[PDB]
Amino acid sequence: PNEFGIFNSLWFSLGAFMQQGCDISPRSL
Amino acid sequence: VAGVFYILVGGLGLAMLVALIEFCYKSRA
Structure with a gap:
C-alpha cells in the first residue's frame, strides 16, 4: 500500500x- | 565506477525482499 x-516511475x-x-x-520502506 | 552499479543492483534486490516480507506480514495478520 498507487501513484507510482x-x-x-520513469519520471521519478x-x-x-x-x-x-x-x-x-515514495512513502514505503 | 563499477561498485556504484553493484550497490545499485544490490540495493534493488534488497528492496524487493522488503516488499516480499511486507506483503507476507500484512496479508497474514
Whole structure:
C-alpha cells in the first residue's frame, strides 16, 4: 500500500538522475 | 565506477525482499 505506475516511475528516476527535484516521493520502506 | 552499479543492483534486490516480507506480514495478520 498507487501513484507510482510505470509512467510515473520513469519520471521519478529521470527526475532524480538529472538532479532536479521529485514531485512525488515514495512513502514505503 | 563499477561498485556504484553493484550497490545499485544490490540495493534493488534488497528492496524487493522488503516488499516480499511486507506483503507476507500484512496479508497474514
